[PDB]
Amino acid sequence: EVFNATRFASVYAWNRKRISNCVADYSVLYNSASFSTFKCYGVSPTKLN
Amino acid sequence: NCTFEYVSFKNLREFVF
Structure with a gap:
């Protein structure tokens, strides 16, 4: 609902959604080809699930 | 926030916090 949402806000006024109390898997971010760029900087991508 | x-x-309802 934050990645497949219909409308987003601008870059100067961006939407801030606090995600907590759930399961962070991120595998849909690795396998899906709908993304053009996917870069993790502070943490290795595979050590998240 | x-x-x-x-x-x-x-x-009778007892609670412990």
């Missing part, structure tokens, strides 16, 4: 949110005589 919300960090969590959840939404679901005759009687």
Whole structure:
């Protein structure tokens, strides 16, 4: 609902959604080809699930 | 600044917090 949402806000006024109390898997971010760029900087991508 | 949110005589109800 934050990645497949219909409308987003601008870059100067961006939407801030606090995600907590759930399961962070991120595998849909690795396998899906709908993304053009996917870069993790502070943490290795595979050590998240 | 919300960090969590959840939404679901005759009687004696005891509680411990």
